Design a binder for this molecule. Sequence first.
Ligand SMILES: *[B]([O])([O])[C]([C]N1[C]=C(C([O])=O)N=N1)[N]C(=O)[C]SC1=NN=C([N])S1
Length: 355
Amino acid sequence: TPKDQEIKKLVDQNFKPLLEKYDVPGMAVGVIQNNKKYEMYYGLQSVQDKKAVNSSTIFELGSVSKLFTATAGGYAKNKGKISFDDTPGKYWKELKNTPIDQVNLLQLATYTSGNLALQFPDEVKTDQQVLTFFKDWKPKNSIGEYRQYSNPSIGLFGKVVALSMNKPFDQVLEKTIFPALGLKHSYVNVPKTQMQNYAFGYNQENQPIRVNPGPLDAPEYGVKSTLPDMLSFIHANLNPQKYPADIQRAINETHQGRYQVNTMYQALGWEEFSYPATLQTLLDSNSEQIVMKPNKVTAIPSVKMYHKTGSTTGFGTYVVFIPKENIGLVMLTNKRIPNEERIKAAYAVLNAIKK
Ligand SMILES: *[B]([O])([O])[C]([C]N1[C]=C(C([O])=O)N=N1)[N]C(=O)[C]SC1=NN=C([N])S1
C-alpha cells in the first residue's frame, strides 16, 4: 500500500538521523494507525554478534515497564483482588499497622506517598532489606498531596498486586497479563532460548551493557519486549473494547487521570494530556522539575492523549497513542537518547501522517 511507503519516509525523516547524531547501534520504530501496523528497523541488535534489528529483537523497556505494572493493578482491581483504597499491609502482612500502611495503593501507584525518592537507597539490595526499608518508613510530606516520581513507590504497588493474585510478579505478567494482551515475546526474565534475540544496550562510550537485578526491579523497569508486541500493546490501549472484559477493564483503569500537575494528568502509569497537546506540553512532562522534584497535585478532559518515556543505562523507549485519531507510535533504541528527541521525533511523525 502507498501508506506503507508514506510511513517509512516519515520515520526515516525524523527517527533515522537520530542514529547518526547519537551513535545509536540499533533502533525499532513502529506506527499503528486504523488497526494497521508499520514496523521500521535500523542498525544492529548486537555489535559483537553483527545481528540486525528485526521483528524478534528484544529491547529493555525501562520505565515503560510501569505501564504493565499499572495494567496488572487495574486487572486485579476489577477482579476484586484489590481496591485502590486498600493499604499495602492488607496484603503484605509484615507492613500491617506501620506508617507505610497509611498510604493507599493508588497513592503508591501515582507517586504521592510524600516520602519516596526516585530510587531505593543504594544499600537496599536484598528482600529482607526491602522489607526493613518499608517497615522503617515514616511520612514526610502530607500523604496524597505531592507527586515525586519514584521507583520504590510503584514497585511496592506491583509487589502488593502480585500478593493479591497469589503469584510472583514475574508470573503475574508472563502468565496472566502478557497472554491477555496477546503478546508473544515480552518477558520479565528472558529465557535461554530467547537470549539470541535479546539486544545489548550500549552506554555513552559504546560499551555493551545489560540491565542488572535490583530491588523490585521487575515492576519498576525490568520488562523486555519486541516491537510487534509493543504495537499490540498500543493497539490494546487504542481499542480496549475489542478485548475480553477482564483485560478491557484493566486497560480502561490505566487511562483514568487521578490528578494533575500543571498541564500533565497522572493516570495509572500513563501520563495523560488534553489533545491536541502542544509540543512544549509533552516536553514539560520530561522537565527536571516534574521528574526529579516533588510537586503539589491538583484535583481534576474529553479529548486526551497519553505517552510514557522509559530508559535504562543502555536503552531508550517511548510510547504514545492518540485515541481520537486511532494512532500510536513506539520507539525502541539500544542506546539511551535524550527524552526530548524521542518526543519531538514522534510528535513530527504523528502530526504529518494523513488522517
Ligand atoms: B525510568 O526510566 O524513568 C527510570 C528512571 N530513569 C533512569 C535512567 C538512567 O539511569 O538512564 N533514566 N530514567 N528508569 C530506571 O530506574 C532504570 S535505570 C537502570 N539501568 N541499568 C540498571 N542496572 S538500573
